[PDB]
Amino acid sequence: GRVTNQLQYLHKVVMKALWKHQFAWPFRQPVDAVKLGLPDYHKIIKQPMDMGTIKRRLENNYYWAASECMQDFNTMFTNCYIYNKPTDDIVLMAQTLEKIFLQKVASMPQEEQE
Amino acid sequence: VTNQLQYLHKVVMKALWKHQFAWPFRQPVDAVKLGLPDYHKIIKQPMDMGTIKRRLENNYYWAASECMQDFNTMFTNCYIYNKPTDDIVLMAQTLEKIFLQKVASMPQEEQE
Numbered sequence: 001g002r003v004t005n006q007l008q009y010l011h012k013v014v015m016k017a018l019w020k021h022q023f024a025w026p027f028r029q030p031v032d033a034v035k036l037g038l039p040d041y042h043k044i045i046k047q048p049m050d051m052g053t054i055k056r057r058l059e060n061n062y063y064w065a066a067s068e069c070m071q072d073f074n075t076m077f078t079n080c081y082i083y084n085k086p087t088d089d090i091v092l093m094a095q096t097l098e099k100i101f102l103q104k105v106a107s108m109p110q111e112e113q114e
Numbered sequence: 115v116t117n118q119l120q121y122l123h124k125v126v127m128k129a130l131w132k133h134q135f136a137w138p139f140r141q142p143v144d145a146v147k148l149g150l151p152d153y154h155k156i157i158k159q160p161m162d163m164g165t166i167k168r169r170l171e172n173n174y175y176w177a178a179s180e181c182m183q184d185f186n187t188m189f190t191n192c193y194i195y196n197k198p199t200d201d202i203v204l205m206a207q208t209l210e211k212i213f214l215q216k217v218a219s220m221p222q223e224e225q226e
């Protein structure tokens with residue numbers, strides 16, 4: 001990967017806002033399926049993702065393009081909607097964080113420049 | 115009309131609308147037709163491409179982020195309502211990836 005204007009933005013503007021949010025705590029580290037008593041979690045969710053993984057990937061220059069990092073955010077929220085029951089609080093927490101994500105993504109620099 | 119909404123109409127909706135996986139999303143979920151009596155009990159804001167397109171055509175949106183949320187609600191409903199193993203979820207995941215890909219290249223400063 002590399003460093004771009006868009007990836008800096010996703011790191012310093014989007015991720016920072018999401019990270020500090022009051023609903024963000026369950027999303028800051030990987031789902032610990034053992035520590036939460038969810039033996040079926042990895043049977044259902046084949047691609048785990050979390051903001052700590054995404055953050056570390058931004059810090060180590062893992063992404064080549066902004067959309068790659070955006071895909072990871074989407075996977076994180078998608079896993080949550082897919083695995084949990086519609087009425088679970090975590091679902092509402094993901095939706096709120098996801099809306100902030102889309103709002104902030106709308107204001108990202110238009111041309112990806114290294 | 116803003117620059118961003120025209121991008122969402124001409125680039126994003128254009129790509130998504132004509133996709134081979136788009137057909138289940140082109141019109142509102144018809145719960146009677148699809149035999150899903152609990153659909154509207156679980157899903158409280160139904161959303162679909164036909165609605166989003168109609169809205170883009172009739173200048174309903176005041177901001178790009180408002181259209182983006184609709185697209186997002188449409189996909190989120192799908193993941194929340196359906197079983198993880200259903201094909202519709204796969205189809206939604208594929209469309210949403212294109213959405214995000216295109217959205218990453220949208221004009222940045224929403225000017226009227």
Ligand SMILES: Cc1ccc(-c2c(C)noc2C)cc1S(=O)(=O)NC1CCCC1
Nearest residue numbers: 026027031036079080083084089090093
């Ligand atoms: C502690 C925790 C962390 C992550 C998850 C989680 C995420 C995120 N996505 O799926 C699951 C399951 C669930 C949990 S939890 O143990 O289910 N607790 C939830 C109650 C309401 C908010 C948190």
Ligand SMILES: Cc1ccc(-c2c(C)noc2C)cc1S(=O)(=O)NC1CCCC1
Nearest residue numbers: 138139143148191192195196201202205
């Ligand atoms: C025909 C149809 C249309 C819409 C849905 C749908 C959407 C969109 N979101 O939730 C449901 C349920 C489901 C169906 S369906 O009847 O479940 N058939 C699907 C199987 C794979 C492709 C079509």
